[PDB]
């Protein structure tokens, strides 16, 4: 059972599949990817020029059957667009500014199923794995945010089960999902029902050429799917909003229990400030704590000097860095804290 259909994921921050009714400086768009637009995307991915497209490639690929499922409808967003500001414009020339207003779709995603010849689908997918040219979503200022070559080809019978095959991928966990997903699919005669129903509407996106752009109409129908029954909700990948590493804390750990022994050996079991016999070790340079402990930034200390340094660190600021003995600074405050500890701390506690 060789695969017979190809799936396209069309999702980007900004999208614009232009409609037939623009014809002027009001560049509009359609609610779904047009057939001519995705055909031009395919021809750009295969490296076929505009003149070369009109002879064989477009008539060959116009025999496929296409259906688009809506994953996210998006929001239509306009854009004021001036041309030739501070510069002349063609036709002789004129020092003038051209005003226009463009329309894009924002935060939208579509799934396109294109059933056809298995060799055609295989060659098309092979071309789409490494596109010849940069493929955008309608306009050149709309690059895709997801790989078009994402979903694998397969063999199915109807377009409804084809759009049922691919699960719906969820964003962040709180985000809700659409409950009724509209599918817009090409009308199929079947050679028995020769006359289309009255709900079938004409769209004008059957292409012939691209340099003298020519289109013909086609009958398009619109049905719907129910999520869960027809499309299973996929689960998001392992991800999170980036947070700075809050490190960890663990002394029971045997590796630190031996690093402190190495430190007490290497400073010869003596304090750095008052040179009394050492009791513990202060953990200066708290970065790389727990798993990447280097017995260099640690400094052995007695109980009174360690308590004084902890008193100084609890007061004032406190960040990943610490207060390091052997510094010529902070000596006077450490000695004052030593005096206060000696003359004020009560052992009855």
């Amino acid at each position: 059972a060789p695969p017979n259909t190809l799936f396209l994921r069309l999702e980007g921050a900004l999208q614009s599949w232009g409609s037939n009714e623009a014809k002027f400086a009001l560049r509009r768009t359609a609610d779904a990817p047009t057939k001519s637009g995705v055909l031009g995307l395919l021809c750009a991915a295969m490296g076929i020029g505009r003149a070369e497209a009109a002879d064989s490639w477009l008539p060959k690929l116009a025999n496929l059957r296409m259906g688009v499922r809506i994953d996210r409808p998006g929001i239509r967003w306009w854009d004021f667009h001036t041309v030739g500001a501070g510069q002349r414009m063609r036709m002789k020339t004129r020092a003038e500014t051209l005003l226009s207003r463009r329309e894009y779709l924002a935060d939208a995603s579509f799934l396109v199923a294109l059933q056809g010849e298995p060799e055609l689908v295989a060659k098309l997918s092979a071309a789409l794995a490494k596109p010849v040219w940069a493929i955008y979503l309608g306009r050149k200022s709309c690059p895709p945010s997801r790989p078009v070559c994402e979903h694998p080809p397969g063999f199915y019978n109807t377009l409804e089960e084809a759009l049922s095959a691919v699960p719906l991928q969820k964003r962040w966990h709180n985000e809700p999902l659409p409950q009724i997903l509209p599918c817009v699919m090409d009308w199929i005669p079947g050679y028995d029902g020769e006359h289309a129903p009255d709900d079938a509407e004409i769209h004008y996106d059957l292409p012939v050429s691209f340099q003298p752009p020519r289109h013909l109409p086609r009958f398009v129908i619109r049905r719907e799917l129910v999520v869960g029954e027809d499309v299973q909700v996929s689960r998001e990948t392992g991800t999170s909003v980036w947070r700075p590493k809050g490190t960890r804390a663990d002394y029971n750990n045997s590796e630190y229990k031996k690093v402190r022994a190495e430190r007490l050996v290497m400073d010869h079991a003596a304090c750095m400030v008052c040179k009394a016999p050492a009791t513990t070790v202060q953990h200066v340079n708290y970065r790389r704590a727990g798993g990447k402990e280097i017995p260099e930034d640690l400094r052995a200390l007695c109980r009174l000097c360690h308590d004084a340094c902890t008193m100084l660190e609890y007061g004032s600021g406190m960040t990943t860095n610490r207060i390091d003995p052997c510094d010529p600074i902070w000596r006077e405050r450490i000695l004052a804290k030593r005096k206060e500890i000696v003359e004020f701390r009560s052992r009855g506690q």
């Binding site: 007061g315 004032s316 804290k337 500890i341 004020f344 701390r345 009560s346 506690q349």
Partner: protein, 165 residues
């Protein structure tokens, strides 16, 4: 949040001498007046050893000093925005309400290190109307995650819900 409960219970268990010691240290650091440092270390250190969670040191210090100055019976269901809204509703709606509301809304702009006096004026307004309770556990939990946006959102929403009724 059991560590916060133990912290608040130990705060209520305090005698009057160390309460006066903490009262004398309002607005101060942690590096001076050694009895305060020793008392705070005795209060806070056993929480980390048994309980994996523990309130932040600055939050715990602020809560201890505020409890020393403004001794309130800890009671569940007496969060600060709700009491503030109940006080604000029984006010003149033209002059006093904007002033007191501005003093309340000043709070949700700073960090933990500068909330002492803007909280002390709030506790003074509370003590003016003879309150007898305050949710120290909920206030500590909210103050811990003060940088999360839904925390401030729920703080303001609870204040508005108590104000409106």
């Amino acid at each position: 949040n059991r560590g916060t409960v133990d912290f608040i219970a130990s705060l209520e268990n305090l005698k009057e001498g160390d309460l006066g010691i903490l009262r004398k240290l309002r607005g101060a650091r942690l590096d001076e007046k050694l009895p305060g440092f020793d008392l705070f270390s005795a209060l806070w250190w056993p929480l980390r050893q048994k309980n994996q969670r523990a309130p932040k040191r600055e939050v715990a210090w602020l809560i201890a000093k505020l409890f020393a100055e403004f001794r309130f019976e800890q009671r569940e269901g007496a969060t600060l925005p709700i009491l503030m809204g109940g006080i604000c509703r029984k006010l003149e709606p033209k002059k006093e309400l904007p002033r007191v509301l501005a003093r309340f809304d000043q709070l949700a702009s700073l960090d933990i290190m500068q909330m002492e006096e803007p909280l002390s004026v709030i506790m003074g307004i509370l003590r003016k109307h003879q309150q007898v309770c305050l949710d120290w556990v909920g206030l500590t939990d909210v103050l811990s995650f003060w940088e999360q946006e839904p925390v401030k959102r729920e703080w303001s929403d609870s204040f508005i819900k108590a104000y409106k009724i």
